[PDB]
Amino acid sequence: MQDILDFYEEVEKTINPPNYFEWNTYRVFKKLGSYKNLVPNFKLDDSGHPIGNAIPGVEDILVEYEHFSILIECSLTIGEKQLDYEGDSVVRHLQEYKKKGIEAYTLFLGKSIDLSFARHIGFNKESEPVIPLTVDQFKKLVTQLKGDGEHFNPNKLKEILIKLLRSDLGYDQAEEWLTFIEYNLK
């Protein structure tokens, strides 16, 4: 697992960083295990390298656990372009999945979380819960989960995502929300 986490620092030097970023994130969830289904929305070439070829309109990665699902959306885009490029598709994918009636969260993974994007995805935390993490926060989360040899319990991950969601905070409390996530993780 530490190998996968360290590889995030090499993603930007690959031939197609976006493809390797989503792939590396899939490797984390595959290694954590304990899922019923894990669906990467991209393909591998014959050397096992990610090569994109995503289906339009579908989340980057879906992991279905027994009692809930996580849609994982990965982007190397920063600043207001993060909102412009990802805001609508992140929310739309979750809305679509939630039509199934299954408890689900989106984990959005970026290098840095833009405040306008956070305001957008914080609009409806009841029906469209999205938890934004930076790569550094996500690494901390994985290491806290696995570094001491604890079995991976998806239900513990669900509890953590609900805590980090801060459903008590409305969209216009984005500064406080992102501070809370950082403070809890880092």
Tell me which method was used to determine the 3D structure. X-ray
Selection from 164, 98, 170 nearest residue 127 by Cα: 98
CATH number of 1-186: 3.40.91.50
Which is nearest to 61 in space by CA: 96, 31, 86, 25?
25
Please report which residue ranges of the chain form alpha helices under DSSP H: 2-7, 17-32, 80-98, 115-121, 135-146, 154-165, 174-184
List of residues 6+ apart from 102 with CB closer than 8 A: 64, 68, 69
Q: Which amino acid is at 70?
A: I
Domain ranges for the chain: 1-186
Amino acid at 32: L
Q: Which residues of 104-138 are buried (b: 16+ CB within 10 A; e: fewer)?
A: bbbbbbbbebbeebbbbbbeebeebbbbbbbbebb
Q: Are 69 and 103 in contact (CB under 8 A)?
A: yes
